[PDB]
Ligand binder design. Structure first.
Ligand code: HEM
Ligand code: HEM
Ligand code: HEM
Ligand SMILES: [K+]
Ligand SMILES: [K+]
Lengths: 154, 154, 155, 154, 154, 154, 154
């Protein structure tokens, strides 16, 4: 395995580990508040990050690197729905920047299989960004109280 | 059967008999107002207290005590949705306080089967407290009118 | 919206149902405790039937814009053995039916025909309970107490 | 594994071994006499004691103790139905006293899983005591001859 | 019922009671060690002995004897698989010797039904001897480590 | 919500978060090596810890504490099967010690629902300790090469 | 169709033709030795190379090139399991080297559909490399004789 590919893959892994925990706690906060539709959506977002972490771990091991599950960076935890959505969005904008940097390097060293894994993760993160921007926009269009009302029941 | 255990069990049963009637009336009031989702939920809370009452009666009889279904304490009847939910919450905080006291005494006299029964009731009353706190929080987050609207239809 | 005295009558019938619910639920669990499971099961169904009658009275009182009274619980008639328990249920039902007839009279007088119909349905069911109770007491005499109890051991 | 917990568990195991044999014999005596409903019921009680003994043996071995299946205490065999039911009841009153002492001890040394195993056995033995006292009461209520009649057919 | 027949049936029954407990403990020992295939087979041998005991108890009662479930002989408990297997084998060789003597005596006094019962028990114990000798032979042919490995999984 | 209960629950949650990542990495290491039976079992151990962590987060929120998903303690990563099993066992021994201390405190302040939650986690960790010790015992009884051989296929 | 793209595709097709025959012969050698699990796995590796050749042949025709099925390079045939696995691995390392050079060129001349086809082949060859290095590592971990024993049966 190329050394900087492994480094990049461990950096993406690191970002996924932050997002697993952030989304899981956000899901459980939403469920606690009785906003069960947000909580369920955010739970599935956490599970998707878990699956990506799994694929990254497996690839790092095949390339004979050491997956780093020890370093957990800063969780962005909001205190209300609007903040939590914006925190998830801030995290995803950092995650896609790093994914693009990793894909650029993979292409340069001809690691096309790693590039393809990272591109699939990127597509999934951009769909999350689409979801988050749509939610923030809906809060503006229907108002916050209606937007929360619409997320009470699954 | 330990005399004080029978006394605590009859105290818990007295609490259940209040909650049966309070929840049933609150249920039928919400149904009458067309808030059928609140009515259905509160109906199931009444049924669950009927089941706990039944388990308490069976245990008191096995311990050779006299179940007391004669003394009905004070019902806390609200006159609107907010008051009714806070009356249920006030009832449950007293119920759990008495359950903790019954559990301590069961342990002290080695009545572990009565303790286990009481702990199962306690877990179910904590779940009701959780629901009730959540509803009061949703009234604040979505507004009362939206909250009621969301409880019109089952 | 409703007639005030109709509501008072319906709250009085409701009060009788709330006694019956508790009395029959306790008798049922006493019979189960003693191993007389067929009696226990029948009495449990009588208790459930009174619960449903109470539900219909509560719903009708609310519709009529009265306040259902679930706070006042009158005197439970609890027996010490099977024969007393059956007589206690019978004593309760005889009072219940007297009050039903008085409430039906009043509904009729003020033209509350839907309330009268609800109360007649309750009365039919309570008379069926009286038939059951009188029949059991008669069977205790015909087959003897020990055989009667024996026949109610198994469901 | 706590040495005194293991001694308590072997003590309870010893009682179960007595009960297995006592109830199995009582079952086959009732079947021999044609009281097939008593015989079937007592067979199931014996089977339940066999399952408790299994769980005790598995727990003792996990705690690194030696399960004692060698010491068989005194079986209380009756000569007729009324004595047999009282022998079973005498055995269970001794059995539940030992269980309560064992639970106290497991609780103090923080062996909460052992305590939970013993609590499940205790609930089962209290159910047996309920059955036993109910049968003795029924003999008084319906008369011995009717009582036995009712236990001829399964 | 012939007095010595009944003595022989209580002797065989006494042997069954030892085997029940020995095999049951050996089963749970094997399970505790993760040799689940040995544990499962030895559990089924214990159950088989339980069923023989039941048939003996029933026959003793019909003959108007007193089944003796009080006297529990010495359990032969091994410390490892080879010893446990040899212990079972030693117990069975004693059991079949006793069964042959009982059959001789039943034939002598013309209790042909008891003889037939004992013969069916004998056939089953000889099948257990077959299994045990085959296992000890396999340890020799495949080696102990392989033999144990082959009994890890059910 | 009692402040020290919440501290205990967050300490147990910290333990779960370590175990999730340690077991997940060990699972994927074993899969990478072709020891797919070990990899599958360790995956399920990790998912089980994830589920425990979920329940802790929900209880901490209901008690109006802040769940700590930010602090990740030291993963104990082995470099061969024997060491990985021992690292799992060391983690589980610390985990159960902390569970017992939390259960004591819950009992002390009468938080019987938290204690019940903790006791179910404790039973699950003790089953894991049972598995781990059995595996280490098997390596000694069948030899390391046979033990690994038996864990190649699912 | 770009002339050098066609030449690269014909080079990869040449590598697939070697792999087809080498893996097929290895498969039947393993079957002949009674190592049916290896022979079954290697048969499926051969089929996969057959399917890759088919996709290459189709793409070359579409680009108006001449598929070259005439030139068969050097088969690497081993004479025991360890050698056959290392021969497969040597062939795959060469194959993946050529695939990367082919993809680089497709990207330069903007033949993204050919690049897509080769990247899919490349991922499949890296999975085969994963398998081969895993098998070689298992031979070391469980020993040759156990490794081969584990591959006698399908
Ligand atoms: C105001 C007093 C009560 C009312 C209005 C009431 C009402 C009801 C109703 C409407 C049902 C559903 C029955 C059906 O449709 O099958 C029910 C069920 C039941 N009730 Fe009550 N009830 C009352 C008091 C009690 C009390 C004091 C007990 C004592 C244990 C009790 C025990 C039960 C039980 C065990 C069931 C069956 C629940 C189940 O397992 O699904 N009820 N009740
Ligand atoms: C007098 C001695 C015993 C007798 C006569 C006896 C009899 C029986 C019988 C007749 C069965 C049902 C077998 C079948 O048809 O499947 C059985 C099952 C069983 N026995 Fe025993 N048994 C004895 C002692 C024991 C002992 C000491 C243990 C130790 C645990 C034990 C454990 C079990 C278990 C676990 C079952 C399966 C129960 C189930 O899950 O259905 N038995 N026994
Ligand atoms: C706070 C940490 C985590 C929590 C609370 C958590 C929680 C969960 C839960 C509740 C499930 C569903 C389990 C079920 O009911 O079957 C799950 C699934 C899963 N988790 Fe995690 N998890 C966490 C961390 C991780 C990490 C770090 C990874 C991988 C590196 C991971 C990988 C997975 C995988 C692969 C699944 C199965 C997903 C699927 O295919 O459905 N999880 N997790
Ligand atoms: K009779
Ligand atoms: K082997």
């Amino acid at each position: 395995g190329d050394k900087k590919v492994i480094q990049h893959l461990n950096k993406i892994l690191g970002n996924e580990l932050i997002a697993i925990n952030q989304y899981f706690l956000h899901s459980r906060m939403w469920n606690f508040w009785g906003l069960k539709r947000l909580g369920a959506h955010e739970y599935h977002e956490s599970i998707d990050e878990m699956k990506h972490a799994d694929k990254l771990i497996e690839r790092i091991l095949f390339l004979e690197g050491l997956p780093n599950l020890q370093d957990l960076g800063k969780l962005l935890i909001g205190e209300n729905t609007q903040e939590m959505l914006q925190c998830d969005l801030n995290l995803e904008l950092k995650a896609t920047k790093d994914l693009r940097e990793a894909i650029v390097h993979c292409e340069q060293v001809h690691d096309y299989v790693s590039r393809d894994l990272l591109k699939d993760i990127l597509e999934s993160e951009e769909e999350h960004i689409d979801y988050l921007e749509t939610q923030l926009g809906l809060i503006q269009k229907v108002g916050l109280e209606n937007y929360l009302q619409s997320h009470m029941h699954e």
